[PDB]
Structure 1
Amino acid sequence: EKNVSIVVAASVLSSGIGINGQLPWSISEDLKFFSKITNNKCDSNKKNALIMGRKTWDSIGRRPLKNRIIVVISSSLPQDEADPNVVVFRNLEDSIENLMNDDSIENIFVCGGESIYRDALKDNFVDRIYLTRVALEDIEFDTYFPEIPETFLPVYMSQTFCTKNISYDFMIFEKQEKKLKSIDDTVDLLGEIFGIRKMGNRHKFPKEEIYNTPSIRFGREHYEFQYLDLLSRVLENGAYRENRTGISTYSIFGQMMRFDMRESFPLLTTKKVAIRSIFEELIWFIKGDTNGNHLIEKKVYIWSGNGSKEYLERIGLGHREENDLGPIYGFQWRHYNGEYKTMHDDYTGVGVDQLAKLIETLKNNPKDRRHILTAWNPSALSQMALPPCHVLSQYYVTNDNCLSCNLYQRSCDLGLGSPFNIASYAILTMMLAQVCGYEPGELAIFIGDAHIYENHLTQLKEQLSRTPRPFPQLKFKRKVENIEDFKWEDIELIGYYPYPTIKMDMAV
């Protein structure tokens, strides 16, 4: 009655595992994971059994694996008794007799090609699945991993790792069966006595119907959950509130999201995100530009709503040209406190250049605690087409020469602005890291008013029904001299396999 687990590394979409008798990739850390998970035992006087098919036995050179016993399933191989570390069986059913007569075997691992995988799943021999999702799909496969049956549920999904620009995950699946202690009861009783006087009741845990992949309870390591859980928390505790637009929101206050940038790029996979528009807006900020037409001329329409004749006249800026957004992010980054006139004037030399001072300080005094870039200028708020949402950012150089970023966001549209903000400040930190000579670190986003617009409810709930996939990789094709020299052609997005786009309208 010992445990039987599948160990497999398959592609993220088509679940390919092999091609021409070998693997479609070469990931060293994945093999180490196979080695450590198949050697993991509890009894020093027992060994683990690794079951594999004959063709898989050929692909590993027909040589034994240390500290383990390999069980080859073959109809033609001679049942040789010379090697005690390799044993041959004529069928998979007869091979699963290490449970009974062989008390010297502690755990059993199935890992031997499509034929053995499919037979082990069809006959319900498998209890656990150790899946390594690999972000490679536009290549050739001839051997696939079977679709995981509905009797299995995911219980763990690791963060995204990177090897030679290849993104990969680690997941565990458990086969469902039938059907502290008093701390939960005491907390529930306290919540019944104190209604909303108990702060726990104002931060209720999301219900299962709005929880992304609810079967993953204690292993929600993938940092896309940092965004999906915020959606669920809003759906559970968001107060219905009006705002300056005609579209009400469900809002909560004081939230946090954390993302890794060392081994992945925080571009959401549960929805296809317009990465090009994000980059074009970011380089538009860096150049100090406030002319909205330059984004529209590059097929980027995210600032069209807040820069129309009707919207500008409504907020009392009818004197402006159609897309003259005024002194905003790009103008406070390069010309802070500069007297703004129009989008056509020359501002070279005006205001404080925070971005230049930031870059100079990052490489000359890295351990300084004042790497701050702000956009909140109370003297210029009335002239802006929209006050800053990503208000302030701080940057940090670790001891191992990595650049981390903290961002405070006063207002967060979780449907549209939030994924853009995550990717935008990830790219910005990477740009600062390359110009200053560091590596990307971490990205923390601290949110004030985190809200969901009521016309996004059907869409975001749809997005919550999609299990996340490994984050992609973002690499720069060339090293630039000035941070303003980055071009969209210099960006390489590797291994991005998202779910279909989800259309959502912006509230003007």
Structure 2
Amino acid sequence: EKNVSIVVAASVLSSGIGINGQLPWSISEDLKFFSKITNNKCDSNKKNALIMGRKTWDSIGRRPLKNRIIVVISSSLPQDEADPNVVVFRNLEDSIENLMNDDSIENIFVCGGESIYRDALKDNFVDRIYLTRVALEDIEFDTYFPEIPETFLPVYMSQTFCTKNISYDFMIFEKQLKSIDDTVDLLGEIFGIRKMGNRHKFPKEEIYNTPSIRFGREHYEFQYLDLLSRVLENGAYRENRTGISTYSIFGQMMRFDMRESFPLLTTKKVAIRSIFEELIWFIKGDTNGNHLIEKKVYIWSGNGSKEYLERIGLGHREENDLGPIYGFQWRHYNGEYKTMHDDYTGVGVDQLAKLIETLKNNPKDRRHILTAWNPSALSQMALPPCHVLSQYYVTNDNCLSCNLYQRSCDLGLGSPFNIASYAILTMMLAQVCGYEPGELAIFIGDAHIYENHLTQLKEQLSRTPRPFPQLKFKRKVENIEDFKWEDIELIGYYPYPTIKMDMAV
């Protein structure tokens, strides 16, 4: 009995491996992973064995590897007794005998082609699968990886990495103490909601995304998918200013990486264009809702209709004049807001401009804050600022991190937008100031789920995540308000089908 694992790097969707006798990508870090994973020996005078087909043996140059015995599955190659680091077997079934004897071989790894992968799974010899998912699908394959059978379960999913603008993950598939559990549960019976642990229950398998991945939830999309589960388990049914009631908890956070990936949800086709047009709308200082409607973006029409505006006591306002919201408080703080058609160039504290000047001249400064809560002009807003405070931080490696506090997040409609919106905003500040994107942390107050999103959000938790895409700018801009949608390149985004959710006006 010895561990027999599979090492493979396939595409994210079609699961393709190699084209015309060679690989369709050149990722250096992946090959280094193959080296480290196949040289993992626990004893000293022992070496691992790698199994591959002839066409794979040909593709690697017919040369042995460092302290690894190469096993070739060929019906034509002669068993050369000269080379001890390369052995040839006539078939895969006969080749699996270095487990009942040959103690020298510690572990066994299967890394051949489709012909060897398919026969290794159908014969039930595989105990573990090391999968490297590459985000490449607009190309052509000729050799694919067989679909993983239901007997294997995902146990680990790494963070999204990047190499030459190509995103890739690392997953593990396994074939599927007691003294504290019998005490915390007893204290949970004595104290009900007196014990704070009962107020934050661990979600059950029915709302936990990919529950087989227990200890290896490293993909930072789980920071969002586990928040949905945490709301369904502990969310309190509550009313609000709209007719749609919510399930809300208080005090949650999400952490994201922006160096090797771009935090854009893959479990739902997020409209990335609508997020950008809203962000550049904020950066320009514009509070005219029609400008977004004139760009085929209808996300501020509900909160800017004639019925809604007169309902909240703003009948004196034009159709889509939202008012001093983010975008007016960013560029003009404490400015006498008249209408949307007015000229505020020069009035108000330009927080965004001073923020850039502070990030360049004083990086070690701790007060790189951008606020949006102005109590003096709240009754004039069509809607109070949801994402309020935002703090930025420069590391010693010229990286730019971002922290956001959100008073209430509409998980399903507002959180996926706010994740990408401030991720793009951080990258824009990083380019203009000359830094690199770092980490993104979002601190949430009233994390709620509207009751008409339960059917859709329950579907999102059923979809296993995919690696994050890459976001690259097409040109360096002079100022900051010069970005255009054409200057944005989204690389390797293959999400799940979009699910429609209605906005609670």
- What TM-score range do you get, normalising by the shorter chain? over 0.9
Measure how far apart 1:318 and its partner are.
Answer: 0.6
Secondary structure at the residue paired with 2:330?
helix
Could you give the per-residue CA deviations for residues 247-305 of structure 1, whole angstroms, max 9, x where no partner exists?
00000000000000000000000000000000000000000000000000000001000
**Correspondence for 1:31:** 31
SS in structure 2 at match of 1:407: strand
Mapped to 1, the partners of 2:495 and 2:389 lie a distance apart of: 30
Cα distance in 2, alignment partners of residues 233 and 299 from structure 1: 35
Instruction: Tell me, yes or no, if structure 1 residue 357 matches structure 2 residue 354.
Output: yes
Looking at structure 1, the residues matched to 496 and 298 of structure 2 have their Cα atoms a distance apart, in angstroms, of 22
SS of residue in 1 equivalent to 2:282? helix
Distance 2:101 2:210 in 1: 39
* Alpha-carbon shift at residue 463 of structure 1 (Å): 0.4
- Give CA deviations for 1:349-405 in whole Å, capped at 9, x if unaligned: 010000000000001000100000000000111000000000010000000000000
How much has 1:174 moved relative to structure 2?
0.7
* Alignment of 1:205 onto 2:202: yes
Deviations 1:96-130 (A, max 9, x none): 11101211100000000100000000000000000
Task: Report the equivalent of 1:461.
Answer: 458
1:403-453 alpha-carbon deviations (Å, 9 max, x no partner)? 000000001000100000000000000000000000000000000000000
CA distance in 1, matches of 2:228, 2:282: 28
Rounded to whole Å, the distance in 1 between the matches of 2:301 and 2:41 is: 60
Q: 1:442 aligns with which of 428, 439, 448?
A: 439
Give the secondary structure class of the aligned counterpart of 2:340: coil
CA distance in 2, matches of 1:415, 1:468: 15
Once residues 218 and 111 of structure 2 are traced to their aligned partners in structure 1, the CA distance between those partners, rounded to angstroms, is: 25
- 1:130-150 Cα offsets, whole Å, 9 max, x none, are 000000000000000000000
Greater mean alpha carbon deviation, residues 91-100 or residues 401-410: 91-100
CA–CA distance in structure 2, aligned partners of residues 137 and 396 of structure 1: 36
How far apart, in 1, do the equivalents of 2:412 and 2:134 lie? 28
- Partner SS, residue 423 of structure 1: helix
Residues in 1 aligned to 2:29 and 2:480: alpha-carbon distance in whole angstroms: 34
Partners of 1:95 and 1:101 in 2: CA distance = 12
Q: Within 2, Cα distance between the matches of 1:407 and 1:185?
A: 39
SS of corresponding position for 1:455:
coil
Q: Deviations over 1:45-94 (max 9, x none)?
A: 10000000000000000000001100000000000011100000000011
Look up the match of 1:141. Answer: 141
Q: Distance in 2 between matches of 1:283 and 1:346?
A: 18
Provide the C-alpha distance between the structure 2 equivalents of 1:84 and 1:369, rounded to a whole number of angstroms.
Answer: 62
Alpha-carbon deviation of 1:322? Answer: 0.3
Q: State how far apart, in whole Å, the 2-side matches of 1:362 and 1:82 are.
A: 65
Please tell me whether residue 452 in structure 1 is matched to residue 449 in structure 2: yes
Following superposition, the deviation at residue 495 of structure 1 comes to 0.2
Separation in structure 1 between the aligned mates of residue 50 and residue 289 of structure 2, nearest angstrom = 61
Matching of residue 387 in structure 1 with residue 384 in structure 2: yes
Separation in structure 1 between the aligned mates of residue 59 and residue 313 of structure 2, nearest angstrom? 72
Q: Please list the CA deviations of residues 151-177 of structure 1 after superposition, one character each: whole Å capped at 9, or x if unmatched.
A: 00000000000000000000000111x
- Please give the alpha-carbon distance, in whole angstroms, between the structure 1 residues aligned to 2:405 and 2:213: 29
Aligned identity (percent) is 100
Distance (whole Å) between structure 2 residues aligned to residue 251 and residue 500 of structure 1:
26
Please state whether the residue corresponding to 1:235 is helix, strand or coil.
helix
Residue aligned with 1:382, SS: coil
Point out 4+ residue stretches in structure 1 off by more than 2 angstroms: none
Distance 1:327 1:193 in 2: 51
In 2, the alpha carbon distance for the partners of 1:113 and 1:498 equals 27
Distance in 2 (CA, whole Å) between partners of 1:128 and 1:41 is: 16
Matches of 2:70 and 2:103 in 1, distance apart? 16
Q: Distance in 2 between matches of 1:435 and 1:97?
A: 61
- For 2:336 and 2:159, the matched residues in 1 are separated by 46
> Alpha-carbon deviations, 1:188-216, whole Å to 9, x = none?
00000000100000000000000000000
Describe the SS at the equivalent of 1:226.
helix
| C-alpha separation in 1, matches of 2:220 and 2:235 | 22
TM-score (norm 1): 0.99
Equivalent pairs, count: 505
In 2, distance between residues paired with 1:58 and 1:122? 24
| 2:405 match: secondary structure | strand
Of residues 183, 188, 191 in structure 2, which corresponds to 1:186?
A: 183
CA-to-partner distance for each residue in 1:17-65, whole Å, 9 max, x for gaps?
Answer: 1100000100000000000000011011100000000000000000000
Shift of 1:497: 0.3
Q: Indicate the SS of the match to 1:282.
A: helix
RMSD of aligned alpha carbons: 0.3
Shift of 1:307: 0.2
CA distance in 1, matches of 2:35, 2:468: 25
The secondary structure found in structure 2 opposite 1:329 is coil
Secondary structure of the equivalent of 2:279? helix
C-alpha separation between the residues in 1 aligned to 2:263 and 2:101? 50
Corresponding residue SS for 1:231: helix
SS of equivalent residue, structure 2 residue 154 = strand
Corresponding residue for 2:394?
A: 397
Q: Give ranges in structure 2 of 5+ residues lacking alignment.
A: none
2 CA distance for matches of 1:41 and 1:439?
Answer: 38
Q: List per-residue Cα deviations over 1:202-258 (Å, max 9, x = no partner).
A: 000000000000000000000000000000000000000000000000000000000
Counterpart CA distance in 1 for 2:93 and 2:360 is 64
Counterpart-to-counterpart distance in 2, 1:288 and 1:406: 21
- Secondary structure, counterpart of 2:248 in structure 1: strand
Q: Which runs of 5+ in 1 are unaligned?
A: none
The separation in 1 between residues aligned to 2:315 and 2:94, in whole angstroms, is 82
Following superposition, the deviation at residue 181 of structure 1 comes to 1.3
What SS does the aligned partner of 2:217 have? coil
Matched, 1:266 2:263: yes
TM-score scaled to structure 2, two decimals?
1.00
